Structures are given as structure tokens and as C-alpha cells.
Design a protein around this ligand. Structure first.
Ligand SMILES: Nc1ncnc2c1ncn2[C@@H]1O[C@H](COP(=O)(O)OP(=O)(O)O)[C@@H](O)[C@H]1O
Ligand SMILES: Nc1ncnc2c1ncn2[C@@H]1O[C@H](COP(=O)(O)OP(=O)(O)O)[C@@H](O)[C@H]1O
Ligand SMILES: Nc1ncnc2c1ncn2[C@@H]1O[C@H](COP(=O)(O)OP(=O)(O)O)[C@@H](O)[C@H]1O
Ligand SMILES: [Mg+2]
Ligand SMILES: [Mg+2]
Ligand SMILES: [Mg+2]
Lengths: 367, 367, 367
């Protein structure tokens, strides 16, 4: 009956039935084993904690993110993520619903095969399909044309779609935002004598990466008044009681995303990968990619975009073109709000890969 | 059969079966041989008197404490303590019950083996285990987080614990309180012209260390009003009828522990060893070590602590952090009431070292 | 006039003019004030002794290293270090030369500014520059490619360099060896019944860390032969006439630098940090990072590396890729013999930060 949209984020895995409100459960993609000797003898502990509870047990575990640079490390950790998601969040049996899974646009073969095969044999679902996360972000703002910028930890993408076809030859995948921003924040906060090295404490870096950062309009000129002894200091409080005063590094960390040359890699800035994906599309269609520029994903929630992005695009594109960048509030749930629209609707009600078809065809059902 | 918790005090050896009230026997850990020439000729007097009988025969013996600086001096005296303890207090044979023994956290190797080994061949016990005295103090107050203190005459320890694991990197052992406080009390009672030198009479010094002593809120401000003519004098009476009036030195002796520069040693104050053991724990756990500071051991019974310790820590700790320091009645028996809770409980009924397994393994069994 | 290279040791300050032999003066940085009351009104006693004289007057002082966890404690003690170093060792006046100072590759900013500024106002030197300690280790063995190690009591570092560019993305800082090895030797020597707790005596432990330790080739098998009566026992003689017999623990203390699991801290050994810095470098260059592995410092002077390090890396590295590990003699003076080659060579004779430029610009001239 009711289909299930379960999003394999690298965040922030999101789980909720098909429509109509919001993700039922969201928690960080963490499994963590206990690194210290037991001496109270309940015994009372698990062999492996998942999140939320692996984020309540900080400082006693060794956190292992099972998805790293756009790929899952091994399915031994992945199945334990899955077991936690179905059972102590959604509560429903896996044999009850057809499921809908998400992937990253341009993900390595044979990691969709191996996934599909393992998931059928481990949880015994009755039907399934895998839709890519960028394409789904079209549905959330309900547009049939435009270039989609879907940016989440740890893979961003630039996919062009026109009424309502996706060009296979103009899709760009960057392995950059947001975990490299997390690692960079840890590298420029060490620069003020605040050292973070332990895995649990690495989460604190994420919590200040969320809340306290912002982006400039013109970097060099916002940087200029930062050099003056004028306040940009906001004072954060740390869990053990420590008080940190950051100012410069606060706008510096997300600004890193414009120009990967700050980490020295040859990769082009979001400025130019957006533009170069548009300029791999056909000449006539370019007219309508402007003003259907749609940003998405959780790593676009800094309170200093899109007007940085705006000022940058308007400078690089042709003269007198209508360029408005549509960025809805609460971009982090865009993908899920996509998935919800698909699986609740017909036509695609008769289009899942069903069990008899899977048994007959085998795991080689890629296209 | 019911288990036996027999606690290897540094005091004050304590003995009583597992559960549920108080130890049956507590008495000074002393052996004393008769030093003066014999003339009564009944005769039959014992070669070595143990406590408490060696404390009702003061002035005719030469007391030799079998435990000094937290380690047992020789097993010739120790076996006579043991034989006396089981037989002439409890009235039971060690063959009947599994035992539970205690140690000092960070006790020199190879003195846990030789102990374990000698006890199997001397008393023919069916099973045993050795738990460290600091860890056991958690059970007494039902804590699942917090820093634990076994402070006895004369080895103290400082162990931080988080639910329900031990931290190898945060544990500190001081060979400071309390026998050096006794020896210091005898050295500063010489300052008022009352000189004591004999071992047996040293016990009287311990008895005034118990009853008369107290700690200040602020040393310097109690010291100021001590210089005034107003009375802090309490009049003690001595075993042969003599009257001593001490006042200034009365609050000075336990105050010595708050910074042992009085002795001359470089060793840090309890104030700071408490704090510095906390700042060797992981950052997110520190939040809950504050306000689960639980004191223990008989040597913490001076009336002025813990509110000296409280006022001192709140000054050294980060701003606006909650620090409730827990120190109720029962602290002299804290460790033992801990041991009682363990040996009655399952799972740990199957976790004693039993004789066949010992026979196979040998005395190399530690870890 | 000839420039002066004075190396701001983590240890262990080294001082000597630009080239070409060895440093004139080496001593382990300690300052010690006199802690007991004077009883000879002679008296002649200085307020602060530096080393050598503060290592001759052990047991009546409280030794304080001015550089702790890779940063100077405060400039009140540091300025007295400096004044002693230039004046009462090297004899030359700072007013007569450009000087050359060393730093860590990654260290709290702006404590390189404050340093540079205070040193200019206190000693009023004609010109200066601050070079990182890791880069200089290339010069010492005349390498044009390779990964550099400054490991001193207590900062290690891992910097990859390619002819003659430094790669920012791959620089890794470990706050691991060697003072935590000093603390670890003190923590496992209490396990054999010899206690060392007071400040002066802590130096003696450090001296036994120098001479008698060694690293195993195969850990598991060295542990096997330790359990038998097969002698690995060496007899040390101790300052007050005492005899120390160490076996197993002799190889246990340095083994800590592999596998930080022994302390429980979340980090990976030199084995893995070497690899993890290489696999953060661009693909083509990796070919010459293998076989230009250059070890350095004083805390790599154990007589059981590098062929352990080699056998371990060779197992983890890609198959049939040749890996030479070059550890020269002289490693304690590596940094200094590096600095010496640079400051004697033009072109960089005209590139010191000079007084007129400093006076106009202020502390920001650092970058
Ligand atoms: N307000 C915010 N500002 C900046 N970054 C944020 C904010 N909220 C969340 N993030 C980042 O966004 C990430 C979540 O992105 P998400 O949309 O879940 O990506 P995915 O769906 O691919 O997992 C988190 O890792 C977090 O670091
Ligand atoms: N009321 C008191 N005030 C101060 N000290 C006391 C008091 N009662 C006992 N003590 C001291 O505490 C010691 C006993 O401590 P205890 O908890 O038995 O240590 P352990 O268990 O390690 O032997 C005795 O040596 C005695 O000097
Ligand atoms: N033969 C040796 N074996 C092991 N360690 C040594 C030896 N000689 C010196 N050390 C250690 O090396 C340290 C000195 O390292 P050094 O190169 O001076 O570091 P830095 O230059 O950063 O101060 C000393 O603290 C000492 O403990
Ligand atoms: Mg995504
Ligand atoms: Mg005790
Ligand atoms: Mg160094």
C-alpha cells in the first residue's frame, strides 16, 4: 500500500513514508564501537551503537561514517544502519511496503548492482527502485526545466534538465562539499590553538559548521574590513565549559568553496562548474536554463548565499540575460520532498522492479 | 555458598560476608611482639598479638604495620593477619566460600601474583578475584559516571569513570594521605612541648587525628582569626591522666593536605590532581564529570571537607559550570559496601577465578 | 656579519652560528626556582637557574619546561631563557647579527606574531626570520623530494615536499611523541615498583628514555620471548646508588609510538600517518614520495627503527613499489645543520625581515 522513501544521504539519512509532510527520522550517518575497557559490569552495552544514540555517547566510542567520498565503505556496516532505520525509527516490517532508494548522480558501477542484490537478499522487500538525488530536487520546487545544483555532504552535483529530459553529456559531479569543508574548518580552527583530533569531537566541528558560519558578497572587500580591529567575534561555548571567540575564520571556511585552489586542487569553483555545465548544453536551450537556476541540499544553508552566487554568475554570463537564482527555504529536505511526490503518484505506481521480475532477471537489471 | 568480601585496608582491614549491612570485623592492621623481659611465668603468651588485642596492650609491644606506602611488607606477618582474620573474627574456614579481595589501584607488579599465589597454597580457597578499591566506590552511591577517591592511611587514588568503562589515560595515584598526616601531627605536636616517640603511643596520635581535627573554608582567613586571642582550644585527656590544650595546630594538621608545601614535596594539591585527572579525559565526557564528583575513603571524614574542596574547584573550573560534590555519611565503609553489592549479583557469579582454571593457567594470570 | 641560528627546541634548545660543524650549546630548556628555605646566609643564589646549572642543581628546585605541548608557556620565563642563551653561552651580542629562529610547521597563530614582536622589542636585533623545523630536514641530507619528520619532546609532524614545493593539503600534525613517551615510561616503571613523582626526578626518567630503550621488529614475537626466562634484562644503576632491573618494559615504552591504542587516544601510528600524508598528495608525485622517506629529530633515535618502519610500510604500500627509508646518523642536529646551509647561502642573504621594514609594517609582516 503506502510506499517508503528512505534516503541514503551522507548526512543525515532521512526516512519517512511517501508524502505528505516531512522526514520522520533524521540522524547522522554514524556507527561507533566502544574503545575503552568495561568495569561496571551491567554489562548493558551494544557491540555497535548507531545514531541518535551514537551521538549521545560521545567520547567513549570510535565513530565510523559508513559513506565516505560518495561511496559506502562495506555492506557489513551498511546493513546495521539499515536495521536501525527500519526497526527503531519507522517500526514497519520490510516485507510490508515497496521501497524507494536514492543514490548519488554518477556513482561507480557496480555499486548499484551489489547494493540492489544485497538489499533484496538481506531484507526481503517486495519491490524497489533507485532514483538519483539531483533529479528529485526538480520535483520539490515543481519546475520542468532548469539546471539543478544539489549540494550535500560529501558530494555536490550540477545536472541540467530541459522539459523534461536530462542531457547525459552535460552532467558534472564534484567530490568536494561538505566533508572537506568540515576538515578545512578543523584545519583553520587549529590555527587559533583549538585542537580537535578525536573522532567524537569532530562532530563539534560540524555543529559550528552549521550554525555560526556565513558567506560574504565580495570576499576580498569583506576580508579587508576583517583586517581592521572591528568586531566579527561571536563567542561560542563548548561542551566541557570552554569559551571560543572566532571572527575571521567564520566566513573564511565556506568561502573556500569558491576556488578549490584554497586547498590547491585543480578543480573549478562552483561559479565556473555551474556555468560550464550550462555551456555544455545546446545553444537554443541555454535561454531557458537562465532563471531556472535551482540550488538545493543541506550544504547550501549558509546565510550568505545565493547573492554571492548571483553576483558571480551575472558577471560571467552574457550581457542582459534574465538570471534569478531560486533557493527555497529548508533546502536540506529537498530530495525527500522529491521522493515523496514520485512514489505517492501514478503513473509510476506500476514501475517498480518487482520480486518475480527480479528473480527472473537477476541483479544485472541496471538500465 | 555465599561469598566473602574481605577488604585489604591500608588502615583497618575490614571483613564481612557478601551483603547487606556492615562489615563484621574492622580492626587496626598491627602485629606486636613483647619487647620487655618476662617475670610472671604462667606462661603461655602468644608469639604475636594481632589487633584489636594489640591495641589493648599498648606500651609493652613494638607495633609493626604490615602495610606501609600501600604495599604489604612481608608475607610472614601478612599470613598471620589473614589466619587471625578468618578464624578469630569471622569463625569460618576459607574452603567453604569464594572470596573477593581488594587492592590499591596502580599496585607494583609482581605483588598481585605472589599474593594471589600464596593465598591459594596457604588457605586452599575454592575461588577468588581482586578488584581495585577505587572502582568499587561507584556501587555504594549507585553512580554511572564520576571521579572515585580511595584515600586511606597512607595511599590515596584519583580515578575518573564514564558509563561503564575505565579510562587508562586518566588515572592518578598519590602516595600522600594519611600516614604522613599522622607523622606530621606528631611533628607539630612537638611544637607545643608534648613529645611522643614510641610506636605504641603513635596510636594515641591517630585517635586525636580522628576526633579533634577539622578543615577551614579559607585557610588564610581562619589563620588570621587564629592569631587573635579568641579560643579555638579543645582540651584533650591522655591515657595516664594528662591534659593537652591544642587550638592553632588543631585545624592546621588536615589543612596540610591542601598543598603539601608544608612537608616540602613538589607533589600537586588534591584541588589540582582532581582537576588535572579530569583534563586527561575526552572533551565531551568532561561535562558530566562536573557534578558527579564523588568522595570516598575514611580519611575524608574531617568536618570542613567537602565545602573547602567545593569552593576551591568552583574557582578553578570554567565559568558557569554546575559542580555538586557528593559526600554523604558511611564513607569509611564505602569500598566494602561496594564489594558487597558485587559478590551477591549475577552476571559475576561465573566470573571468579576458580581452582581448576588457576591450576591450568598458573600464577601468570593477571589480565 | 655571520648570521646566528638558534633553534627553539621542543626539547632541548640548540645554539650555534651559521654553519658548519655542530651547535655550540645544547641543554634541556628547564628553569628552576629554589623551593626550600635558606640556612646559609652566604648566599649567592640566583632567582632563576637555567640549564646546564638547573640540571646540576636537581632535587632542590622545581623544574619547569618553558615549551609544553608545542607552545611557550609565557614570555616572562622565555625572555630569561633567551637572555641566558645568547649571553651566557654564545657570548655574542644580538645587536651584531641577523638571527634565524625556528618554529613548528603548524602552530597557534598569532603566537608566531607575538613571539616575533616581543623578541624585536626585548633584544633589538638588526634582522630576523622564522623558518619551520620540518623543511630544514631536507637540506641536512641534500634531498630535492620527500616527506619530512620533526619529532621532538612533544611535537611530531608529517610534511610532504616535491622539488621544491610544499604541498599545503597534505601537512599532518601529531601531538604524540616524545614527552608522552616520557610520561609513559614513568607510568610503566611504577608497574615494576620504582616510583617517580616529583618534578626534579622526572629528568632521570627522560635520561633512561635516551640510552636504554629499543623498538622491536616483530612485536608479537618479542612479547612471546619476554614471558620466558630468556634474558632481555639489562641492569641500570641509579643516581643514589640503587639497582634497577628492566626486561619487557625496555621495548614497551618506544612501542607506544606505533598504535596509540596503548594510551587509548584516537589517532593512528607513525606507520599510518606516513601513508595518510602520502595518499593526500596528487597521483603522479606519489612515485617519488616512495623512496625519499626521510626520518629526523631526536625522538627517532631509538636503535630499532627504521627497518621496523620499513617492514610495516612495505606491507601496506601497493605491490612491488620500491620504498627506501633513509634515516641518517646526526638526526638530533638535523634541523640545525639544515638551517646552517640556508642562512649562509645567497640569494636569501637579502631576504631577512629587516628593522626599517618591521618598524613600518608591524607584526603582520610574518606572512
Ligand atoms: N545551517 C547550515 N549551514 C551550513 N551547513 C549546514 C547547515 N545545516 C546542515 N548543514 C550541513 O549539511 C549537511 C547535510 O546535508 P544533506 O542535505 O543531508 O546532504 P545529503 O542529503 O546528501 O546527506 C550536514 O553535513 C551539515 O554539515
Ligand atoms: N572521623 C575521622 N576524621 C579523620 N580521619 C579519620 C576519621 N575516622 C577515621 N579516620 C582515618 O581514616 C583511616 C581509615 O581509612 P580507611 O577508609 O580504612 O582506608 P583503607 O580502607 O584504605 O584502609 C584511619 O587511618 C584514620 O586515621
Ligand atoms: N638515543 C636516544 N634514544 C631515544 N630518544 C632520544 C635519544 N636521544 C635523545 N632522545 C630524545 O629526543 C629528544 C630531543 O629531540 P630534539 O631533536 O631535540 O627535538 P626538538 O629539536 O624538537 O627539541 C629528547 O627529549 C630525548 O628524550
Ligand atoms: Mg546527496
Ligand atoms: Mg584503600
Ligand atoms: Mg621540533
Amino acid at each position: 500500500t503506502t510506499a517508503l522513501v528512505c534516503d541514503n544521504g551522507s548526512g543525515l539519512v532521512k526516512a519517512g513514508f511517501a508524502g505528505d509532510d516531512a522526514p520522520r527520522a533524521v540522524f547522522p550517518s554514524i556507527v561507533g564501537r566502544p574503545r575503552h575497557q568495561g568495569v561496571m559490569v551491567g554489562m548493558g552495552q551494544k557491540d555497535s551503537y548507531v545514531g541518535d544514540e551514537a551521538q549521545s555517547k560521545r567520547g567513549i566510542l570510535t565513530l565510523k561514517y559508513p559513506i565516505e567520498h560518495g561511496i559506502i565503505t562495506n555492506w557489513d556496516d551498511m546493513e546495521k544502519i539499515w536495521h536501525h532505520t527500519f526497526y527503531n525509527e519507522l517500526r514497519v516490517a520490510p516485507e510490508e511496503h515497496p521501497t524507494l532508494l536514492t543514490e548519488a548522480p554518477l556513482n561507480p558501477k557496480a555499486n548499484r548492482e551489489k547494493m540492489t542484490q544485497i538489499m533484496f537478499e538481506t531484507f526481503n522487500v517486495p519491490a524497489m527502485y533507485v532514483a538519483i538525488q539531483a533529479v528529485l530536487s526538480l520535483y520539490a520546487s515543481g519546475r520542468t526545466t532548469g539546471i539543478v545544483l544539489d549540494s550535500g555532504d560529501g558530494v555536490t552535483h550540477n545536472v541540467p534538465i530541459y522539459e523534461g529530459y536530462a542531457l547525459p553529456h552535460a552532467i558534472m559531479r564534484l567530490d568536494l562539499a561538505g566533508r572537506d569543508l568540515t576538515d578545512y574548518l578543523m584545519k583553520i580552527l587549529t590555527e587559533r590553538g583549538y585542537s580537535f583530533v578525536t573522532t567524537a569531537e569532530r562532530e563539534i566541528v560540524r555543529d559550528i559548521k552549521e550554525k555560526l558560519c556565513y558567506v560574504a558578497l565580495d570576499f576580498e572587500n569583506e576580508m579587508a574590513t576583517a583586517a581592521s580591529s572591528s568586531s566579527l567575534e561571536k563567542s561560542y561555548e563548548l561542551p566541557d565549559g570552554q569559551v571560543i571567540t572566532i571572527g575571521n575564520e567564520r566566513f573564511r571556511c565556506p568561502e573556500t568553496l569558491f576556488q578549490p585552489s584554497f586547498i590547491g586542487m585543480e578543480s573549478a569553483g562552483i561559479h565556473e562548474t555551474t556555468y560550464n555545465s550550462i555551456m555544455k548544453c545546446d545553444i537554443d536551450i541555454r535561454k531557458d536554463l537562465y532563471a531556472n537556476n535551482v540550488m538545493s541540499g543541506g550544504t547550501t544553508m549558509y546565510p550568505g548565499i545565493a547573492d554571492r552566487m548571483q553576483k558571480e554568475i551575472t558577471a560571467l554570463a552574457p550581457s542582459t540575460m534574465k538570471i534569478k537564482i531560486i533557493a527555497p527555504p529548508e533546502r536540506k529536505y529537498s530530495v525527500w520532498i522529491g521522493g515523496s511526490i514520485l512514489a505517492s503518484l501514478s503513473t509510476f505506481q506500476q514501475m517498480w522492479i518487482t520480486k518475480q521480475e527480479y528473480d527472473e532477471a537477476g541483479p544485472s537489471i541496471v538500465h
